[PDB]
């Protein structure tokens, strides 16, 4: 056609479709697609046009154009109080890319040397403290989420940082920053300009984190004179980065990339672990639990890099399929800065364009019987899996996240079995920013494998 995507009619004035979307994100999107006879279509969120790239065959039209054409900056305006002014997506595109590359470099597999033991240490410490009886009842999502913050901190931060800012206090500062976020501001940008009590809190937590970082940096320069230590961590990595123009990252920027890394990795990784365990313990999946048991059957007590990286293909499939079925990020978005072709249409300058892992992961051609968790499945449409994104803004933490998931799975199932206290795997809870299993349905019985 070369014209605009078909518009889905608005029946609710002012609000547009946001209500029907919350009620049933997948159901609503699939209904639009059916009724409009197009995988590319435009919905309306509080007056803003959102064009969905809902055909897995057209994913490349979303993930591949340059920032200058499809930009994430405006979509992330509401996180500026957390990352900081001029940090990540708020910085000019070449500088954004530089800061993101500096972070990515700290999460490459060449940094993973002592991560496996760090993760195992923290996981065993947690299990010993909280899974300390022959059997007992626990909330698996809460416990996975506590292990992820502990493990991430143990891997990424040297012992000195941890003595001043341990995983508990770090989680508290981050939860105070996160608590302040108003993602509605994507569609109601007037919010970003208002005095809100949120802003004061957020600024508070961030400035306290940045104070702690500066104090750590000053202390480290002193251990440098003494040659007591030479700590190599996430912080030292970003500290040594130098931009193309010859200058270093400011403290502001360093702090902001640390916050982005920690925000990003916490919920997604915790959720992926939780789903993966929930599926593995369910009676319908005994064959898959068997397979994981076989994979790890001959592993040593103290795992190494090679065991997790190279000898857990099935665990990795489990993690990936969990993300496939229940993607923690439902909608990836960009601001359209200039007219782009998508499918047989032109998406106009000023639209938000979106591509939905939720929608695409449930395309029946790409993923037959998509509600069936099957780690042995393989995509049947090229590039249909987008749980880690793709192209210009593809996930830079994927290997680190999967490292943690797989290690937790090997560590946990070595020492325990688990029983779901429900007939079914929990329902996904779509009411949060990062989507996981319904927290109240995640009660499980652990059983110590004596
Ligand atoms: C299993 C866990 C994870 C999942 C499912 C996940 C998913 C994703 C997705 C879907 C995107 C693309 C976002 C978009 O298109 O707008 C993304 C990008 C990103 N992820 Fe992850 N992520 C995970 C773990 C992590 C971790 C552990 C980190 C950091 C430690 C991280 C850092 C990032 C960053 C910084 C981006 C932005 C990259 C850019 O704009 O170039 N992620 N991730
Ligand atoms: O968590 C959000 N963004 C993270 C995503 N992430 C996590 C791990 N890897 C990526 C993020 C990305 C890049 C960077 Cl530098 C930092 C972080 Cl913390 C996030 C942000 C916004 C939304 C969001 N905004 N609007 C919606 C929305 C709107 C309508 C319907 C459904 C969702 O979601 C969702 C997740």
């Amino acid at each position: 056609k070369g014209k605009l995507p078909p518009v889905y009619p608005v029946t609710v004035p002012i609000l547009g479709h946001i209500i029907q979307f919350g009620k049933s994100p997948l159901g609503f999107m699939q209904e639009c697609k059916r009724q409009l006879k197009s995988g590319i279509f435009t919905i309306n969120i509080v007056g803003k046009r959102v064009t969905i790239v809902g055909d897995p065959h057209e994913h490349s039209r979303f993930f591949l154009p340059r920032n200058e054409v499809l930009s994430p900056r405006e979509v992330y305006s509401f996180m500026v109080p957390v990352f900081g002014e001029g940090v990540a997506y708020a910085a000019p595109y070449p500088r954004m890319r530089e800061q993101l590359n500096f972070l990515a470099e700290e999460l490459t597999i060449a940094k993973f040397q002592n991560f496996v033991p760090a993760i195992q240490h923290e996981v065993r410490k947690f299990m010993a403290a909280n899974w300390d009886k022959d059997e007992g009842e626990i909330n698996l999502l809460e416990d996975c989420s506590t292990m992820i913050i502990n493990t991430a901190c143990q891997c990424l931060f040297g012992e000195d940082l941890r003595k001043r800012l341990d995983a508990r206090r770090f989680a508290q500062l981050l939860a105070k920053m996160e608590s302040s976020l108003i993602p509605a501001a994507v569609f109601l940008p007037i919010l970003l300009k208002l005095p809100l009590p949120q802003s004061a809190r957020c600024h508070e937590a961030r400035t306290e984190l940045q104070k702690i970082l500066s104090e750590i940096i000053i202390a480290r320069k002193e251990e440098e004179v003494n040659k007591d230590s030479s700590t190599s961590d996430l912080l030292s990595g970003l500290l040594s980065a130098v931009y193309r123009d010859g200058t270093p990252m400011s403290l502001h920027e360093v702090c902001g990339m640390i916050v982005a890394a920690m925000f990003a990795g916490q919920h997604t990784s915790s959720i992926t672990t939780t789903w993966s365990m929930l599926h593995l313990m369910h009676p319908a999946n005994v064959k898959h639990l068997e397979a994981l048991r076989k994979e790890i059957e001959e592993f040593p007590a103290q795992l190494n890099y090679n065991n997790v990286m190279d000898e857990m293909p099935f665990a990795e499939r489990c993690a990936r399929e969990s993300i496939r079925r229940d993607p923690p990020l439902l909608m990836l978005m960009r601001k359209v800065m200039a007219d782009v072709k998508v499918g047989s249409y032109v998406v106009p300058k000023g639209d938000i364009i979106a591509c939905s892992p939720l929608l695409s992961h449930h395309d029946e051609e790409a993923f037959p019987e998509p509600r069936r968790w099957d780690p042995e499945r393989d995509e049947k449409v090229e590039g249909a899996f987008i749980g880690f994104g793709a192209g210009v803004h593809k996930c830079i933490g994927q290997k680190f996240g999967l490292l943690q998931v797989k290690t937790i799975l090997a560590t946990a199932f070595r020492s325990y079995d688990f029983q779901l206290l429900r007939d079914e795997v929990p329902d996904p809870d779509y009411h949060t920013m990062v989507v996981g299993p319904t927290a109240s349905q995640c009660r499980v019985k652990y059983i110590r494998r004596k």
Side-chain angles (χ1 to χ4, degrees), residues 18 21 45 75-76 78-79 83 88-89 100 183 186-187 257 259-261 263-265 268 329-331 333 395 433-434:
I18 191 165
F21 188 98
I45 305 291
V75 182
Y76 275 87
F78 79 104
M79 299 193 77
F83 306 153
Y89 300 119
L100 290 163
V186 173
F187 302 99
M257 305 300 300
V259 167
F263 253 76
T268 54
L329 303 168
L330 299 192
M331 302 285 299
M333 299 179 282
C395 179
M433 247 170 80
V434 190

Side-chain angles (χ1 to χ4, degrees), residues 74-254:
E74 298 198 0
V75 182
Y76 275 87
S77 290
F78 79 104
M79 299 193 77
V80 166
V82 159
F83 306 153
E85 294 286 357
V87 178
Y89 300 119
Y93 300 125
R95 193 64 149 278
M96 166 199 62
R97 204 70 259 164
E98 295 197 81
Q99 294 173 8
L100 290 163
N101 287 347
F102 292 139
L103 184 52
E105 288 176 5
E106 297 310 323
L107 304 169
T108 54
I109 69 183
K111 303 298 179 164
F112 286 9
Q113 305 309 281
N114 328 321
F115 283 13
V116 168
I119 297 154
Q120 281 207 302
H121 179 77
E122 291 299 311
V123 165
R124 284 176 177 142
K125 268 224 331 204
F126 183 89
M127 292 187 317
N130 309 278
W131 305 354
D132 70 321
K133 282 220 78 281
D134 292 346
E135 63 174 68
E137 272 184 34
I138 62 168
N139 188 297
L140 186 55
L141 180 68
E142 294 178 35
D143 285 22
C144 285
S145 158
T146 291
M147 291 186 268
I148 286 291
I149 182 51
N150 306 349
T151 62
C153 282
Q154 197 70 27
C155 293
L156 295 178
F157 300 127
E159 183 203 329
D160 58 335
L161 175 40
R162 272 133 46 195
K163 302 223 291 292
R164 294 184 177 249
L165 173 51
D166 79 340
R168 193 182 288 178
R169 291 180 62 263
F170 211 149
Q172 279 183 65
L173 286 171
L174 298 171
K176 179 164 176 190
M177 282 184 274
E178 183 202 5
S179 89
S180 84
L181 289 174
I182 315 197
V186 173
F187 302 99
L188 276 334
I190 200 171
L191 285 169
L192 311 142
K193 306 192 184 40
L194 300 184
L196 296 163
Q198 279 87 354
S199 315
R201 241 198 301 277
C202 189
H203 166 85
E204 181 168 25
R206 202 200 179 271
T207 303
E208 169 150 45
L209 161 59
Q210 181 165 313
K211 180 212 181 50
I212 287 177
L213 291 178
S214 65
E215 284 170 9
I216 275 299
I217 288 172
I218 281 153
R220 274 185 186 177
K221 292 178 179 181
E222 301 179 14
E223 261 184 303
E224 200 173 343
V225 174
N226 294 349
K227 321 285 189 289
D228 261 80
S229 270
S230 189
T231 308
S232 217
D233 71 353
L234 169 58
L235 179 52
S236 66
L238 303 163
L239 279 180
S240 59
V242 180
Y243 295 112
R244 282 167 44 73
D245 74 2
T247 68
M249 311 189 74
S250 63
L251 207 212
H252 179 241
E253 298 160 347
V254 167

Side-chain angles (χ1 to χ4, degrees), residues 215-322:
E215 284 170 9
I216 275 299
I217 288 172
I218 281 153
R220 274 185 186 177
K221 292 178 179 181
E222 301 179 14
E223 261 184 303
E224 200 173 343
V225 174
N226 294 349
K227 321 285 189 289
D228 261 80
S229 270
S230 189
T231 308
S232 217
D233 71 353
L234 169 58
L235 179 52
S236 66
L238 303 163
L239 279 180
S240 59
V242 180
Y243 295 112
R244 282 167 44 73
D245 74 2
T247 68
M249 311 189 74
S250 63
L251 207 212
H252 179 241
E253 298 160 347
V254 167
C255 175
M257 305 300 300
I258 286 165
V259 167
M262 295 292 133
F263 253 76
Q266 178 59 42
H267 297 312
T268 54
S269 296
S270 167
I271 287 162
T272 298
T273 307
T274 310
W275 277 126
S276 296
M277 293 179 72
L278 291 165
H279 293 300
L280 281 158
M281 77 182 68
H282 186 108
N285 303 311
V286 301
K287 292 261 266 155
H288 303 313
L289 178 63
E290 214 168 88
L292 174 69
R293 289 216 161 288
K294 310 318 142 238
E295 180 154 87
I296 62 157
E297 213 179 35
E298 290 173 354
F299 280 168
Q302 285 159 118
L303 303 186
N304 53 66
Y305 174 103
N306 290 314
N307 296 315
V308 182
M309 293 303 296
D310 307 317
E311 306 164 14
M312 304 189 61
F314 185 76
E316 188 164 330
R317 288 187 159 268
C318 294
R320 287 178 102 266
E321 172 67 350
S322 293

Side-chain angles (χ1 to χ4, degrees), residues 365-384:
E365 184 185 356
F367 302 101
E369 304 179 60
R371 296 315 290 163
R372 173 175 288 285
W373 185 81
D374 180 8
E376 312 209 305
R377 67 156 87 237
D378 292 313
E379 81 189 356
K380 295 174 181 213
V381 171
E382 175 187 1

